[PDB]
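Quick one - inputs below.
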Amino acid sequence: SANSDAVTYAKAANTRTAAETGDRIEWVKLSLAFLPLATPVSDAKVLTGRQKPLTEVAIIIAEIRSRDGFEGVGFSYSKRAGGQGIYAHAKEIADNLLGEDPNDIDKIYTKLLWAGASVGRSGMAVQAISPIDIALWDMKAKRAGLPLAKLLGAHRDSVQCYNTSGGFLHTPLDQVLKNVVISRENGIGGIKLKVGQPNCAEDIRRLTAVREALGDEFPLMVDANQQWDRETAIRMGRKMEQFNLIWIEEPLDAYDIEGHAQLAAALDTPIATGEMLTSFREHEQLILGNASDFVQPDAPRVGGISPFLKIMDLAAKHGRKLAPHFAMEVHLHLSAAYPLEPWLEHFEWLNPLFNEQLELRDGRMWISDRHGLGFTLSEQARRWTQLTCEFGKRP
Amino acid sequence: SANSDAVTYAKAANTRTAAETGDRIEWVKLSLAFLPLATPVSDAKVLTGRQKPLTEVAIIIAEIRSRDGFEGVGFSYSKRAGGQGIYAHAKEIADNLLGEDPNDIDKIYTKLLWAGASVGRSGMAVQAISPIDIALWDMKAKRAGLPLAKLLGAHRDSVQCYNTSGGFLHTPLDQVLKNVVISRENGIGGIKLKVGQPNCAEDIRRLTAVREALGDEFPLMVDANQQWDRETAIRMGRKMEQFNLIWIEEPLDAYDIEGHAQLAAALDTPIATGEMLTSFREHEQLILGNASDFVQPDAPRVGGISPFLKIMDLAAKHGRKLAPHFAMEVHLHLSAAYPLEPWLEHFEWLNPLFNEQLELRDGRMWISDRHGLGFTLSEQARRWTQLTCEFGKRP
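Output:
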């Protein structure tokens, strides 16, 4: 019998608890590095005069080590102003990590938010937590002897990949076409072209050329980087319907929810947006407002893997496709865990920071057997480091 | 430089993929056992004539072993009719697990749903997946060398616990009071009394006697098991506001969303419900309808840990508290991972199925250092097994 007329309580033998035997964070190192871009980069934001060409990328790295011998690495970044502040805040809150069980990621994330309650739950402050949150996930996956995608649970072992770095607006059409050949010969699965410049006719000229060279079937997409007004957006949308694009990205201001939704409802061509958003809450508003067919979160920008998972789940509930922005080294794993077929964005920019390179084969990027994020920091990453700080003591 | 005027693609050194190196399921064992209750149990569902007293609990167990030596165990259950069907379906779909990478839990879940697409995505069929899903989570945690709560990430090392076993309607008042003493003496943190019998006067009587014995501060809660109509629910609710109860559980039919929502908005006392729901979708309708202050999902009943997690995330997003039903062996880990302070329900019924027992101290149940669920099947569980089947070959 499993019960009686009264109530009985069992006596435990193994009096040992999870609290007293869990691992502990003992050391943390933060770094602010700058990735130089020899060829200044310009998208529509530059051509409209909203910004200056991009000449470097700030990279904020977090390295964490536990008492029991585990280590995690993660990073966030900034294109243009923002890296100094991300590093500075991370440095001001990092010591809160010491003595914490590294497996209680959300508990730690919350503690970090309270430690910096004055500066919000979105924006730069969460981007300062991103490197740490990502490093903790990297550590847990390694602890389990699994690539991050497998710790989370994968739906696919490789992801469709398209290139963005060879289609910027500072690049002459003849060179853009040369890049398409190089990219395709290397097994790329799609091409994205930057548009949204004042001269609309030119963008059409460039787009028609690319589609012409690629052929009717090869996946092709465009990105306006918020540079069109509503009138121009719909107009260009109608005109582009003919190219059979996988999507039209950021046709309007990143916070113009009704404008995006209106555009997505009027065109059969999918609408994509989200890279500029900096929190789950911001993405939620776009999603509830039916802003786009493709949701494009950026783990470093939204606060790390933890909030990115919540964003993915919400998008999935709304039947939206996922096309994460930049940081393929991290997004490869997240997109592999997405229920619906996703897209991965390629830039060769961060390659020098790591000793390993991802495998691009037949249009898809494959998940290697390496653990966690599957990357180790290179000598160059250290050479490009401008500021660093440490807490605790190396075990 | 990290870029150039054209586009460049690196070359991967390592060529092994997560696909080719991942672990593989090679053996599965399902069991149908019956846990006897020498003392017939009856709540308001029996006193109103809806059901017959409970005399046993069906337990469907799943054991999975991987090629690389990992092992996982999980289970689901049925109180009254339902166990023969859960086991029968689990037996008819289990073979699909062979050759699958055990880490891709959602991927496997989806395959199991397609294998039984004819029988739905809610109800008995997902309860047949439950043992398997739970075993896979048990395995993944063990693979990381962590208790499940730690794999998920915990917000607490122990959970407030209340007893239900000693507050049933077939128990005379004096015996209920004796159980309160026994329970409180064993370190219980709360007491729940079953109410909802035809005689509303006898329920108030018992409730007043229990509050009197416990004192004004001890956590006290009640459960009507859906036996009141809206008229009675509000009247009893007004009358019970004086007892300062932690919550009023299942005052109405489990699917009466507006009815619950109406009671929750009208009363200051929290309203709780959800134990009878059998899927994320069902819980979602109640949550979107603002049905209760406390959400009470049951992992075995909703399809396992995977759907229970999505339910938790939704409830948390809506600012609700969590109080899982039954199966403390599994819910201890899930509630530990909940962001808001939850409650754990205690029954001794399942104690004999496992070799290990949980530690109850100072009103809370503690998470042990044991990995995964932290339980191993006892010899008694084998003695109580009536049916069993196996697939594959033990590694």
